Symmetry: C5
Subunit: 239 residues, 5 copies
């Protein structure tokens, strides 16, 4: 519904990325006790609906040392805490090890108002209809030189960024999260696409621009997964 779209598009909303890998002694547990422990997670995510939005991603076989990622949107990070903690306490959750936990807040754009009108218009496009796209998460930390630049300078650099990314507006969906102070990175970037070679070419195009020289850290980890319904993912651990 619009409640979901609200959380996904409005400013001041927190996005949290939580990554998990299943331990080995999980498969030592009797079979039917694992199909049952999966039901618990199914119901818990249903309960927290409304309050928060939980989307699920299969990282297993695409990201090293990771099976599952949640992307969680919440108006108060306190609620995300409470869900994750209840999730980690489920019998399925107890056998998971964390591979990452990052938070950021959505904000109204800082630079877009200073771009040419034709660019502002093009930025209205953001991905397409895609069922079960690939998703990529790339955390980013800027160098001190970036923050020492004044706004006019950073505006020009971000215009160059945007100019380079323009050909990819339809085939790559984006969402930027402002992370500074909530963990060790400044930004969390998130993308969906059906065409990974397009995403690859997009990043290559951005590598040339001046602002991609101000990234003190880029990735670590770069997470790649496929977006799916949660039951399909947990189904794999009950087999």
């Amino acid at each position: 519904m619009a409640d979901r779209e609200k959380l996904l598009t409005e400013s001041g909303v927190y996005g949290t990325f939580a990554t998990f890998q299943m331990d080995h002694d999980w498969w030592d547990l009797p079979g039917e006790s694992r199909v049952i422990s999966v039901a618990e997670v199914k119901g818990l995510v249903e309960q927290w609906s409304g309050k928060i939005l939980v989307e699920s991603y299969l990282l297993r076989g695409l990201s090293d040392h990771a099976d599952l990622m949640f992307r969680v949107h919440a108006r108060t990070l306190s609620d995300t805490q409470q869900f994750l903690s209840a999730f980690m306490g489920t019998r399925l959750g107890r056998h998971l090890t964390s591979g990452g936990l990052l938070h950021g807040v959505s904000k109204k754009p800082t630079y877009v108002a200073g771009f040419p009108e034709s660019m502002k218009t093009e930025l209205q496009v953001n991905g397409e209809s895609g069922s079960r796209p690939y998703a990529i998460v790339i955390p980013i930390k800027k160098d001190a030189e970036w923050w020492a630049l004044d706004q006019e300078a950073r505006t020009a650099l971000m215009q160059e960024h945007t100019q380079a990314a323009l050909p990819y507006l339809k085939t790559v969906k984006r969402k930027l999260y402002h992370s500074t102070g909530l963990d060790d990175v400044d930004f969390i970037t998130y993308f969906e696409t059906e065409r990974l070679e397009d995403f690859h070419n997009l990043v290559r195009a951005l590598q040339q621009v001046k602002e991609f020289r101000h990234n003190r850290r880029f990735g670590h980890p770069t997470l790649l997964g496929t977006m799916s319904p949660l039951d399909e993912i947990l189904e794999k651990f009950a087999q």
Copy 2:
């Protein structure tokens, strides 16, 4: 307590930040076992109420690989050691992996006397009336260049730091610990706020100042939690 406030405010007091993560095989234990274990911790903290102040924070679901933090204040770090050792020797304690241990001493300010009188007055404000705030801990190591600067130059740079922070005095409470020689960092910074976006905006404001650029290390980890009664944390492990 006036004793509690003296420890939270006086100079010469040691602050310790002790982070723990719970073992997986804690959950392989029967519920009743885990039940008795939580009550013993409360009693321990009360046994030490005379010597030290212990405050508890839920990190689970907010900081990666961390479930619980204590902030401990004491006039002798021997006392903190004895508490934490006794704590780690409780039935609950026996199952925690340590995820961080940092110490520092409160000092009367080094630079503030050299600021303008208006700035000195503004600094009398330190945060808000806040139950269950978010807490953030950021360890900082300065570069060699910082220490090579003379006092006059560092004063000017810290006035700039302070100037940028002034708008956040009401909504972000701060406490600075001098750490050099007690672990691998120079400072432990501690913050409480009800408004995470304000804290994020405060750090962004400070990224711009010239003192920022003198941080050889900033975070790693950046700890994010919710300040809460211990019982509330303990209860999650009893489920």
Copy 3:
């Protein structure tokens, strides 16, 4: 098979490198249950032989903390994900610990068209006949300075790279995968050789060229293995 050869030579094909370590408790099992565990993996590979190419490498005793690598070629990474996910859920797979996971795409060369005719001709040679060669996989990330260079400047630097490599065209087979955006590196370099000292001499030759100073990261890990049929490797694990 020509289709196999198509996957190994055509552009737009994804190469995935998946590394695994066998658990200490795998050898606890009777060779009987391991013999059938091995047959299960065989079955899965055959089942997937219509969509993907899977090749296997023994890393045990040559690469630290790794026993097995797969190199998988697919037209879609989602096919690779499903294969690796299924493989990790087999009884053998359940007793492996995932290690590294890297992906890249094959591309028609960017620079070769700008090289001298003699060099283009020489580049028609790539390895030679040899059974069960050694294999080496080296992930590489370029510095920002590399991407800020224009195409002409990079072409000249890649000419120098190729010039240093010419004596190794026949003794070392090469395959380059374009990785940016799919994990934390820009390229995955893959080599086969019967003569490890020749490979060592190749890398040394390359160390002198200016391009090799633009490597922000090189290796970590440098994977070294012996290429061989899956059956042989797996029956070494069965005994």
Copy 4:
């Protein structure tokens, strides 16, 4: 072993061995753990003719670390045999090592070139004090440091000492030369009753030119309390 001699003579190896206890140690019966603690104490006593072993409680002060030994020996072979026997005890078998650093004591390289007043002041080295705090800071110098001539390093080390003078009484020091034996150049060791004095000393040294030649400083910085072995071990027998 003559204890004062090991602690003060040149050519003596000092070893810093750090250990954390496995969690499954606590699943052992109390009686088994009592016995195990006697085995460790007896082992130290059996080796007390050959090496000096001093014990420090890191639990609650250093992250991921419960126990440190500082061992002095005339030959690292003796230290090796002691630590290996220790690690084979019932208790030792449940410990994870969290550090192992070695260095030799040496006659001073720079002090002969300092002023006579500084040479005299350096005769003072710390503090009659029971159960002090101890700090261990591993240090690696940058390449530039070794490229300097001896005259230049002498002047820089005089500046170091000048800044440290006020603390000679409240902070005991012992410097070990470690290059080639592990990944660091020096192991620094300090004892104090007054951690704020140690803090202030390190701050005073951060300003000197020499402290800008440290490629690596700490990692880990070990903080502990010096204690009779029996008192440290009794914690584990609960």
Copy 5:
């Protein structure tokens, strides 16, 4: 054995350094079962004595997190692979965890022919008659600047290295392995000495030469052990 000596002195021979740490759960095994396990390792080594040389070092109590190291010389790394894999599969081997695996090849010297004649003559002495010496292994990675220097310049720098090392030619035995491309380092240096203070003084003398400023990585780990018959090492684990 002349064949032992050929492996240790001839060019083109591979040296492998394999470090192991005994898991704690070994010690839960009854003493008798561990006695039988030691026996099995002894016979495996004897079986391989025809093709490779295996020497053993006690790292326990001298190198952090490490109990045992093998130095293996082989004419093909394939042989070393098969030995180490069979060793890791023995019951004793299944309770070891790897703390390092590096390979390098022996080469005829690159710079020696460019030194003065008297220096070439001095380099004829390598080490002493010394039973159960200390052994030190230091992996080294050069910076890009080293490889950018021409051969004449590197020759002069290596002459200065050799000049500083001259006093130690009798007291410290040396063996250099060329590792580039086989793992993440360029060289493995290996030393034997009866007097650790002489080795310390040797490294100190070299820290002053221009070449030692080109070491991007030096150690990590620096391995220190005592050379001894394998039986004695293994005995300790039988207790």
